[PDB]
Design a protein around this nucleic acid. Structure first.
Ligand SMILES: [Mg+2]
Ligand SMILES: [Mg+2]
Ligand SMILES: [Mg+2]
Ligand SMILES: [Mg+2]
Ligand SMILES: [Mg+2]
Ligand SMILES: [Mg+2]
Ligand SMILES: [Mg+2]
Ligand SMILES: [Mg+2]
Ligand SMILES: [Mg+2]
Ligand SMILES: [Mg+2]
Ligand SMILES: [Mg+2]
Ligand SMILES: [Mg+2]
Ligand SMILES: [Mg+2]
Ligand SMILES: [Mg+2]
Ligand SMILES: [Mg+2]
Ligand SMILES: [Mg+2]
Ligand SMILES: [Mg+2]
Ligand SMILES: [Mg+2]
Ligand SMILES: [Mg+2]
Ligand SMILES: [Mg+2]
Ligand SMILES: [Mg+2]
Ligand SMILES: [Mg+2]
Ligand SMILES: [Mg+2]
Ligand SMILES: [Mg+2]
Ligand SMILES: [Mg+2]
Ligand SMILES: [Mg+2]
Ligand SMILES: [Mg+2]
Ligand SMILES: [Mg+2]
Ligand SMILES: [Mg+2]
Ligand SMILES: [Mg+2]
Ligand SMILES: [Mg+2]
Ligand SMILES: [Mg+2]
Ligand SMILES: [Mg+2]
Ligand SMILES: [Mg+2]
Ligand SMILES: [Mg+2]
Lengths: 70, 155, 116
RNA sequence: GUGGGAGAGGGUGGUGGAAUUCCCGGAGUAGCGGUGAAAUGCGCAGAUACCGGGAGGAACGCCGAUGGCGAAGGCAGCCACCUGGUCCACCCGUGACGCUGAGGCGCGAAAGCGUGGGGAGCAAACCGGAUUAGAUACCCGGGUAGUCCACGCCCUAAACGAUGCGCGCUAGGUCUCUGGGUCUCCUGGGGGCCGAAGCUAACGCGUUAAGCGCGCCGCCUGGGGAGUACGGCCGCAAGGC
């Protein structure tokens, strides 16, 4: 399976307003994806998590979602 | 059978029909090791069942044993306290054994005086779809379709 | 007396019971059923067969209301949490979609001693 | 000193969503809950389930790790402000200014105390239901103090790495966090795992020493009696030294 960073450009991990790329790092639900599927380093993941929470509080990223086909 | 599969005994064929189920039924009739008396019982019953109804005793025997074979039963399984009755299907070999046992036990639970008469009338009733053996079979099947709520305990 | 023709179906399954509430596309309920609505009384209500029977009974009451297309919402976990959806699929109601919306907190309340 | 860096380090104020409970409303019947089974309990004054709205308290899912920070206790949503510690590179400045540390002083999980707030959920005591030979327990239903906040006390612990602090010396290999570098790698500084020499009663330790040395502090001298008695000091008390 493909990791998120493998298929992506040279993007800003500190931009909480870019929903297009931050949506890639969320799961089918609103959960943040683990490093196994994001292909990020520890520092990169640590920054991404905080930017994702920032975007969430601004109503740009979903706090949680609903699972399908279950 | 802890180690092996307990290979099934292959009964000898029959001298009159040449069929193995007849020999198995004759064994089920035999008691105290008297296969001669049991064979005489079964074959006088064959004559009686072929005369009182003008059909061949072969296919009537086969159809009766086929009518008595059940398709489901219950076994007790220990789960969370006292055990429960769990339904399940039946092996063909066990279907054969249970059918013949119910045949003999319902034949000897009959009022008829002579043994051969009991055997003949029991086979007739079972071949028609009624009688005591088929009643026990349908009670076994009524155990299924009833406690089917435990269908997730099949094992 | 409603003729709803379409709606949602919520399956709340626990380890003590499973209940099905058939509702309309804007949230109000139409009918419902459970393991106690049908004959079972005690722990028998938590078996998958009771969940199947409850789903089927609720689906038939929906037929009485005139339900054809159904969206499924699932909350909780227990025996027959899936059997309810299976019976609901084969009940005669065209299943639109299945959704698991089990509410999980963000670590807000302190559980009972059983749950720690 | 300069220039960079990582962080649930601390304090203050703000702020977000999920969930529980409760209240208002809509729609909707006959049970829900709970257990190995059950019963107490709740429900026709309309519950449970579903939908919308409101209130309030407490805690921060995914990220999260075998991770990080702190002297220890301990510290997880997000934002801002105030502030501590620490690491690296540059080789710039002072020029032995160092190490330890009896007493003292400060900090010190939880529970507990006092005054005043707060109170969803949980929950000692307690009230019931079961189970059992009995149930004063485990299991179920309720439920107060408390848990939360402000301020002042309390000074205990498996306060654990059961390993005091500092410095130097003594094979490496592997995983990792964070810096620098001419960036298959090297070089620092933390977190693990194997294992040289050596150590150990053995288990095991082994550049994060329980190895080889040095400095300084604390403590030990058979078990029970007993962390008891008396005395002193501290404390509102419980009690602590
Ligand atoms: Mg139940
Ligand atoms: Mg912090
Ligand atoms: Mg802080
Ligand atoms: Mg209401
Ligand atoms: Mg009532
Ligand atoms: Mg009542
Ligand atoms: Mg009443
Ligand atoms: Mg209130
Ligand atoms: Mg985790
Ligand atoms: Mg700082
Ligand atoms: Mg110089
Ligand atoms: Mg000089
Ligand atoms: Mg010192
Ligand atoms: Mg001192
Ligand atoms: Mg304290
Ligand atoms: Mg306290
Ligand atoms: Mg108090
Ligand atoms: Mg409670
Ligand atoms: Mg209780
Ligand atoms: Mg009693
Ligand atoms: Mg020493
Ligand atoms: Mg580098
Ligand atoms: Mg540290
Ligand atoms: Mg190292
Ligand atoms: Mg050796
Ligand atoms: Mg070792
Ligand atoms: Mg050393
Ligand atoms: Mg030693
Ligand atoms: Mg002492
Ligand atoms: Mg002594
Ligand atoms: Mg003591
Ligand atoms: Mg004295
Ligand atoms: Mg004293
Ligand atoms: Mg005094
Ligand atoms: Mg004491």
């Amino acid at each position: 399976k493909a990791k998120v960073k493998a298929t992506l450009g040279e993007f800003d991990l500190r931009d909480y307003r870019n929903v297009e790329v931050l949506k890639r790092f969320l799961s089918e639900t609103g959960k943040i994806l683990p490093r196994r599927r994001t292909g990020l380093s520890a520092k990169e993941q640590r920054i991404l998590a905080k930017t994702i929470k920032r975007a969430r509080i601004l109503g740009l990223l979903p706090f949680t979602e609903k699972l399908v086909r279950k | 059978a802890r180690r092996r599969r307990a290979e099934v005994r292959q009964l000898q064929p029959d001298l009159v029909y040449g069929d193995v189920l007849v020999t198995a039924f004759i064994n089920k009739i035999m008691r105290d090791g008297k296969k001669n008396l049991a064979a005489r019982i079964f074959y006088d019953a064959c004559k009686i069942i072929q005369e009182k109804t003008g059909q061949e005793p072969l296919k009537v025997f086969k159809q009766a044993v086929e009518n008595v074979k059940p398709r489901m039963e219950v076994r007790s399984r220990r789960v969370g306290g006292a055990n429960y009755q769990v339904p399940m299907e039946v092996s063909p070999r066990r279907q054969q054994s249970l059918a013949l046992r119910w045949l003999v036990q319902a034949a000897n639970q009959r009022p008829e005086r002579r043994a051969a008469v009991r055997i003949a009338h029991e086979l007739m009733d079972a071949a028609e779809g009624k009688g005591g053996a088929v009643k026990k079979k349908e009670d076994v099947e009524r155990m299924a379709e009833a406690n089917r709520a435990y269908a997730h305990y099949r094992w | 007396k409603r003729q709803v023709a379409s709606g949602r179906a919520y399956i709340h399954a626990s380890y003590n019971n499973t209940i099905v509430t058939i509702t309309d596309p804007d949230g109000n309920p139409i009918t419902w059923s459970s393991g106690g609505v049908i004959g079972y009384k005690g722990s028998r209500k938590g078996t998958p067969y009771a969940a199947q029977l409850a789903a089927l009974d609720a689906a038939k009451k929906a037929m009485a209301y005139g339900m054809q297309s159904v969206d499924v919402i699932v909350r909780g976990t227990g025996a027959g949490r899936e059997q309810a959806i299976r019976a609901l699929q084969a009940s005669g109601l065209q299943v639109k979609s299945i959704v698991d919306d089990t509410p999980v907190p963000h670590n807000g309340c302190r559980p009972k001693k059983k749950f720690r």
